[PDB]
Write an enzyme that holds these catalytic residues in place. Structure first.
Site, PDB file in Angstrom:
ATOM      1  N   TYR A 111       4.034   4.939   5.097  1.00  0.00           N
ATOM      2  CA  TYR A 111       4.185   3.651   4.150  1.00  0.00           C
ATOM      3  C   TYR A 111       5.752   3.391   4.292  1.00  0.00           C
ATOM      4  O   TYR A 111       6.593   3.977   4.757  1.00  0.00           O
ATOM      5  CB  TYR A 111       4.081   4.199   2.529  1.00  0.00           C
ATOM      6  CG  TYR A 111       2.808   4.255   2.200  1.00  0.00           C
ATOM      7  CD1 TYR A 111       2.125   3.238   1.396  1.00  0.00           C
ATOM      8  CD2 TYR A 111       2.559   5.234   1.571  1.00  0.00           C
ATOM      9  CE1 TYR A 111       0.949   3.802   1.603  1.00  0.00           C
ATOM     10  CE2 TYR A 111       1.401   5.853   1.020  1.00  0.00           C
ATOM     11  CZ  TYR A 111       0.893   5.030   1.713  1.00  0.00           C
ATOM     12  OH  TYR A 111      -1.067   5.277   0.405  1.00  0.00           O
ATOM     13  N   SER A 112       6.005   1.662   5.027  1.00  0.00           N
ATOM     14  CA  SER A 112       7.029   1.312   5.748  1.00  0.00           C
ATOM     15  C   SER A 112       7.711   1.044   3.884  1.00  0.00           C
ATOM     16  O   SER A 112       7.569   0.705   2.683  1.00  0.00           O
ATOM     17  CB  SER A 112       6.475  -0.510   5.570  1.00  0.00           C
ATOM     18  OG  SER A 112       5.502  -0.462   6.706  1.00  0.00           O
ATOM     19  N   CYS A 169       3.366  -7.376  10.735  1.00  0.00           N
ATOM     20  CA  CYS A 169       3.258  -6.151  10.304  1.00  0.00           C
ATOM     21  C   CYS A 169       2.314  -6.165   8.563  1.00  0.00           C
ATOM     22  O   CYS A 169       2.113  -7.689   8.674  1.00  0.00           O
ATOM     23  CB  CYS A 169       4.819  -5.364   9.418  1.00  0.00           C
ATOM     24  SG  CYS A 169       4.067  -3.782   9.021  1.00  0.00           S
ATOM     25  N   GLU A 216       3.644  -3.328  13.977  1.00  0.00           N
ATOM     26  CA  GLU A 216       3.065  -2.032  13.241  1.00  0.00           C
ATOM     27  C   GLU A 216       1.850  -2.778  12.239  1.00  0.00           C
ATOM     28  O   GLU A 216       1.842  -3.217  11.132  1.00  0.00           O
ATOM     29  CB  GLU A 216       3.843  -1.866  12.063  1.00  0.00           C
ATOM     30  CG  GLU A 216       4.356  -0.759  11.721  1.00  0.00           C
ATOM     31  CD  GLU A 216       4.918   0.400  11.554  1.00  0.00           C
ATOM     32  OE1 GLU A 216       6.315   0.980  12.217  1.00  0.00           O
ATOM     33  OE2 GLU A 216       5.201  -0.082  10.151  1.00  0.00           O
ATOM     34  N   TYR A 227      -1.934  -1.067  10.810  1.00  0.00           N
ATOM     35  CA  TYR A 227      -2.550  -0.099  10.351  1.00  0.00           C
ATOM     36  C   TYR A 227      -3.950  -0.514   9.753  1.00  0.00           C
ATOM     37  O   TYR A 227      -4.866   0.314   9.607  1.00  0.00           O
ATOM     38  CB  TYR A 227      -1.581   0.463   9.259  1.00  0.00           C
ATOM     39  CG  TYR A 227      -1.293  -0.188   8.550  1.00  0.00           C
ATOM     40  CD1 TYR A 227      -1.771  -0.545   7.375  1.00  0.00           C
ATOM     41  CD2 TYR A 227       0.328  -0.759   8.901  1.00  0.00           C
ATOM     42  CE1 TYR A 227      -0.496  -1.169   6.599  1.00  0.00           C
ATOM     43  CE2 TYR A 227       1.057  -1.524   7.565  1.00  0.00           C
ATOM     44  CZ  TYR A 227       0.585  -2.354   6.306  1.00  0.00           C
ATOM     45  OH  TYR A 227       1.107  -2.366   5.746  1.00  0.00           O
TER      46      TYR A 227
HETATM   47  C1  LIG Z   1       3.025   3.196   9.838  1.00  0.00           C
HETATM   48  C2  LIG Z   1       2.822   3.070   8.480  1.00  0.00           C
HETATM   49  C3  LIG Z   1       2.709   2.824   7.178  1.00  0.00           C
HETATM   50  C4  LIG Z   1       2.216   2.322   6.109  1.00  0.00           C
HETATM   51  N1  LIG Z   1       2.787   0.987   5.660  1.00  0.00           N
HETATM   52  C5  LIG Z   1       2.174   0.973   4.770  1.00  0.00           C
HETATM   53  C6  LIG Z   1       2.786  -0.010   3.749  1.00  0.00           C
HETATM   54  O1  LIG Z   1       3.764  -0.432   3.145  1.00  0.00           O
HETATM   55  N2  LIG Z   1       1.627  -0.445   2.517  1.00  0.00           N
HETATM   56  C7  LIG Z   1       0.315   0.058   2.089  1.00  0.00           C
HETATM   57  O2  LIG Z   1      -0.385   0.127   1.020  1.00  0.00           O
HETATM   58  N3  LIG Z   1      -0.142   1.142   3.134  1.00  0.00           N
HETATM   59  C8  LIG Z   1       0.591   1.235   4.458  1.00  0.00           C
HETATM   60  N4  LIG Z   1       0.082   1.403   5.595  1.00  0.00           N
HETATM   61  C9  LIG Z   1      -0.841   2.306   5.090  1.00  0.00           C
HETATM   62  C10 LIG Z   1      -1.419   3.877   4.488  1.00  0.00           C
HETATM   63  O3  LIG Z   1      -0.748   4.621   5.717  1.00  0.00           O
HETATM   64  C11 LIG Z   1      -2.889   4.550   4.604  1.00  0.00           C
HETATM   65  O4  LIG Z   1      -3.287   4.213   5.232  1.00  0.00           O
HETATM   66  C12 LIG Z   1      -2.956   3.756   2.904  1.00  0.00           C
HETATM   67  O5  LIG Z   1      -2.407   3.281   1.885  1.00  0.00           O
HETATM   68  C13 LIG Z   1      -4.879   4.415   2.797  1.00  0.00           C
HETATM   69  O6  LIG Z   1      -4.277   5.985   2.671  1.00  0.00           O
HETATM   70  P1  LIG Z   1      -4.846   6.418   1.227  1.00  0.00           P
HETATM   71  O7  LIG Z   1      -4.981   6.912   1.300  1.00  0.00           O
HETATM   72  O8  LIG Z   1      -5.899   4.939   0.115  1.00  0.00           O
HETATM   73  O9  LIG Z   1      -7.278   6.495   1.380  1.00  0.00           O
HETATM   74  P2  LIG Z   1      -7.445   7.577   2.020  1.00  0.00           P
HETATM   75  O10 LIG Z   1      -8.149   8.037   1.218  1.00  0.00           O
HETATM   76  O11 LIG Z   1      -6.719   8.375   4.064  1.00  0.00           O
HETATM   77  O12 LIG Z   1      -8.866   6.547   2.493  1.00  0.00           O
HETATM   78  C14 LIG Z   1      -9.374   7.263   3.899  1.00  0.00           C
HETATM   79  C15 LIG Z   1     -10.344   6.074   4.650  1.00  0.00           C
HETATM   80  O13 LIG Z   1     -10.578   4.890   4.096  1.00  0.00           O
HETATM   81  C16 LIG Z   1     -11.300   3.758   5.191  1.00  0.00           C
HETATM   82  N5  LIG Z   1     -11.338   2.194   4.965  1.00  0.00           N
HETATM   83  C17 LIG Z   1     -10.570   1.736   4.362  1.00  0.00           C
HETATM   84  N6  LIG Z   1     -10.855   0.526   4.261  1.00  0.00           N
HETATM   85  C18 LIG Z   1     -12.032   0.495   4.417  1.00  0.00           C
HETATM   86  C19 LIG Z   1     -12.682  -0.813   4.438  1.00  0.00           C
HETATM   87  N7  LIG Z   1     -12.344  -1.896   4.109  1.00  0.00           N
HETATM   88  N8  LIG Z   1     -14.390  -0.271   4.010  1.00  0.00           N
HETATM   89  C20 LIG Z   1     -14.232   0.941   4.371  1.00  0.00           C
HETATM   90  N9  LIG Z   1     -13.453   1.664   5.075  1.00  0.00           N
HETATM   91  C21 LIG Z   1     -12.233   1.606   4.662  1.00  0.00           C
HETATM   92  C22 LIG Z   1     -10.370   4.542   6.332  1.00  0.00           C
HETATM   93  O14 LIG Z   1     -11.724   5.364   6.518  1.00  0.00           O
HETATM   94  C23 LIG Z   1      -9.707   5.761   5.757  1.00  0.00           C
HETATM   95  O15 LIG Z   1      -9.999   6.885   6.941  1.00  0.00           O
HETATM   96  C24 LIG Z   1       0.933   2.035   6.647  1.00  0.00           C
HETATM   97  C25 LIG Z   1       0.837   3.192   7.923  1.00  0.00           C
HETATM   98  C26 LIG Z   1       1.262   3.876   8.242  1.00  0.00           C
HETATM   99  C27 LIG Z   1       0.269   4.171   9.900  1.00  0.00           C
END
Ligand SMILES: Cc1cc2nc3c(=O)[nH]c(=O)nc-3n(C[C@H](O)[C@H](O)[C@H](O)COP(=O)(O)OP(=O)(O)OC[C@H]3O[C@@H](n4cnc5c(N)ncnc54)[C@H](O)[C@@H]3O)c2cc1C
Ligand SMILES: NC(=O)c1ccc[n+]([C@@H]2O[C@H](COP(=O)([O-])OP(=O)(O)OC[C@H]3O[C@H](n4cnc5c(N)ncnc54)[C@H](OP(=O)(O)O)[C@@H]3O)[C@@H](O)[C@H]2O)c1
Length: 296
Positions: A72-73, A254, A294, A296
């Site tokens: 998360y940023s 971003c 960046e 994602y």
């Molecule tokens: C450098 C970086 C910075 C980031 N900064 C932020 C930030 O500031 N704020 C923020 O909210 N997130 C940010 N993210 C994204 C964050 O890391 C997570 O990926 C995001 O919050 C979702 O993770 P989760 O644990 O909720 O879901 P998980 O349970 O890991 O979700 C798993 C799966 O859901 C999926 N998915 C997502 N959207 C869909 C869709 N529409 N249809 C089908 N499948 C889908 C993919 O299959 C993914 O593998 C950042 C990522 C990176 C790499």
């Protein structure tokens, strides 16, 4: 060294403590994006602008193995929101999607955990991570911020470091004299994360910060479609390119993936009017550390 990186890694993360978890999306908006603050006292996690940190969510995945970090940023500056060097903040949106096929609405693991975290709770924080979204030390530099949703997070760190009275007083070395331009694409007005503060910065500093919004549900582009950040970069393509030409200008993108091809197509037409191929000027800006992305 100067830029902090990985003071805490996954095997032995910083056990931080939530101080606040406040709502960013106001009434009438699409979603839940929260501003969560974490106590950093007890350890030595120092971080800078544009960086990220990991949050290891609790529980196991569908295979039984522990949940791995989600980056998360950082939404706050190095000093934190209270400008005390004691906290770190995040701008987290609850991932949610109605079906890849079946079973209805699904909730992201780490994002739901975080958007519903209560103050006083212990969190596993790794980081800091990233040398790709850093702000130049040069106060006279120009900086173009192209954000969508949670991609507002690193822009907030630049803007607050540049424009908050307390940040300025805390940083005699950085008394921002350049021009910063945020083009923020959110679906509704209540979805404008940090609207009040973004707008009050633009009011105190008219000539130093310009704020452009692309609101999908309230605005249409010249072609009748919903207004996106690309459409906005497209109507100001020339100015944006005229600023990109400066040696001190830095551009940051971003948010979720997908906005890069429209920002490029727009900056390409602009650049083509003066004989240059944007993609090749861009390649050179990346090598120079002046074109930052960046998604994602
Ligand atoms: C450098 C970086 C910075 C980031 N900064 C932020 C930030 O500031 N704020 C923020 O909210 N997130 C940010 N993210 C994204 C964050 O890391 C997570 O990926 C995001 O919050 C979702 O993770 P989760 O644990 O909720 O879901 P998980 O349970 O890991 O979700 C798993 C799966 O859901 C999926 N998915 C997502 N959207 C869909 C869709 N529409 N249809 C089908 N499948 C889908 C993919 O299959 C993914 O593998 C950042 C990522 C990176 C790499
Ligand atoms: N319902 C719940 O309680 C719950 C909880 C959390 C989240 N939701 C998630 O929260 C999110 C909102 O968060 P936010 O304030 O951070 O705003 P945001 O969704 O980041 O803003 C980004 C834009 O992406 C779209 N985008 C769409 N088509 C595009 C295209 N051709 N080009 C580029 N972009 C396009 C959306 O437009 P359009 O959608 O208008 O087309 C939207 O304005 C929602 O997406 C939502 O699904 C729901």
């Amino acid at each position: 060294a100067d830029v902090p990186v990985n003071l805490y890694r996954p095997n032995a993360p910083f056990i931080g403590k939530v101080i606040s978890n406040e709502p960013l999306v106001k009434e009438g908006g699409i979603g839940i994006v929260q501003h969560i603050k974490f106590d950093l006292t007890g350890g030595n996690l120092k971080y800078i602008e544009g960086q990220s940190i990991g949050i290891i969510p609790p529980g196991v995945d569908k295979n039984g193995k522990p949940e791995k970090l989600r980056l998360y940023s950082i939404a706050s500056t190095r000093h934190g929101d209270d400008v005390d060097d004691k906290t770190i903040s995040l701008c987290v949106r609850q991932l949610e999607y109605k079906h890849p096929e079946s079973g209805e609405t699904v909730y992201g693991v780490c994002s739901t955990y975080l958007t519903h975290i209560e103050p006083g709770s212990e969190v596993k924080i790794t980081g800091p991570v990233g040398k790709e979204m850093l702000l130049p030390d040069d106060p006279e530099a120009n900086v173009i911020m192209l954000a969508t949703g949670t991609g507002i997070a690193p822009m907030r760190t630049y803007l607050w470091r540049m424009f908050k009275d307390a940040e300025r007083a805390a940083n005699p070395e950085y008394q921002f004299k350049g021009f910063s331009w945020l083009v923020f694409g959110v679906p509704t007005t209540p979805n404008i994360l940090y609207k009040e503060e973004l707008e009050e910065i633009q009011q105190k500093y008219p000539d130093n910060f310009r704020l452009t919004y692309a609101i999908s549900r309230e605005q249409k582009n010249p072609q009748g479609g919903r207004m996106y950040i690309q459409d906005r970069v497209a109507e100001h393509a020339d100015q944006l390119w005229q600023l990109i030409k400066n040696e001190k200008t830095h551009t940051y993108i971003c948010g979720l993936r997908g906005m890069e091809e429209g920002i490029d197509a727009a900056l390409s037409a602009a650049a083509a009017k003066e004989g240059v191929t944007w993609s090749d000027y861009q390649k050179d800006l990346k090598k120079a550390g002046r074109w930052h992305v960046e998604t994602y």
